[PDB]
Amino acid sequence: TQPFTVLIEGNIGSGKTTYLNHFEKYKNDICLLTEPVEKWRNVNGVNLLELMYKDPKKWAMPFQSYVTLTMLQSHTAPTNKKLKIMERSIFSARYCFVENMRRNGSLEQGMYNTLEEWYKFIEESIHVQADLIIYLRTSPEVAYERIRQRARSEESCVPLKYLQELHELHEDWLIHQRRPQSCKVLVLDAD
Amino acid sequence: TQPFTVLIEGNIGSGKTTYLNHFEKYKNDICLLTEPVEKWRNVNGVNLLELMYKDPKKWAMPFQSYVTLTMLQSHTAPTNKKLKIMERSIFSARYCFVENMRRNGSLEQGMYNTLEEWYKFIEESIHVQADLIIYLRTSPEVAYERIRQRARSEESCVPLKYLQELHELHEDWLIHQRRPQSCKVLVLDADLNLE
Ligand SMILES: Nc1ccn([C@H]2C[C@H](O)[C@@H](CO)O2)c(=O)n1
Ligand SMILES: Nc1ccn([C@H]2C[C@H](O)[C@@H](CO)O2)c(=O)n1
């Protein structure tokens, strides 16, 4: 079982990290799970994040596959705290990042299908705690800015086009669509 | 949630199907799960099995991942029979087929790694019922004949060396490197023409 869980969603460079760094001083009453980027950067030695951004058509599949795994581990990790805040989720991994990779051709149909089958099996079994989604809404330009200020080795080549597509997907999912009673969405202007 | 389970393992062309047919008649007391191969041939329209054999460096990883999923589905499927018989398992996929694709160079480090991490997680979360393993043991040459006469479209380009690698892998797993926390193992002579 999991306590009240909050999912911090948003584009790359939407200030999620900075934002949830605030909650750090309260780690004693709140379970804080940042994106397991360190895991993605070091999978038994390999940097999947790096490989994916360097050669999407080749590494998008294994990468998103691992991301699903680690997000799933985070969603199901037990805790004694009564509040849980996670940076991003399996929902955004599926509806935004994977879908985007399918559109730009990084994921070949059979690869997209495999990932979708996994998402279906998970939802059919492993229930995921999601009570609140705070959506740090931004504009691609501002997101591009943040990314540029912090020299992230892997994100050193993400085009503005890429951010726009991710942005649109986050919009289609969190705003231009009725949400279930099981989960509320709080939109904040990041910019 | 799972009853006594038997995993039927063997190389490609070891007569699993034929052998599993002898169990059709007991369908009332036995839950028989066949390899979800036809699912692999139809993943919402795409034939992952074909693609895997056609260009493993690109498709081995997605294919095996879907295999894991489908096998996992069988390992945890509903049943109301007091005996369960599965054709293959996540174990043969992990220790034989994935290992083979790693050795032959089809799976690059990160892909093999991703696959292995899923295995760790699957067994840390779920528990897979495995009480006995029946091993239809054959020689790679005999297995090659079966595959040849079977004439399966996707296996059309499977060379003897491939079956040779898989054979060694099954041997190491079910016989040599075997240990007393043993899932008990019954070794059958699948070179026999029909038992
Ligand atoms: N499903 C996901 C989740 C995150 N990321 C990437 C986007 C950023 O580069 C980094 C997070 O800041 O992780 C990704 O490619 N796919
Ligand atoms: N983990 C697995 C399981 C099966 N197969 C292949 C072997 C045969 O070609 C077909 C099963 O009869 O699927 C495979 O490549 N990998």
UniProtKB/Swiss-Prot annotation, chain B:
Superkingdom to which the source organism belongs: Eukaryota
Gene Ontology terms describing biological process: DNA biosynthetic process; nucleoside phosphate biosynthetic process; nucleoside salvage
Binding positions (ATP): G10, N11, I12, G13, S14, G15, K16, T17, T18
Enzyme class: transferase
Protein EC: 2.7.1.145
Similarity annotation: Belongs to the DCK/DGK family.
Protein name: Deoxynucleoside kinase
Organism of this sequence: Drosophila melanogaster
Residue range from the parent sequence: 18 to 212 of 250
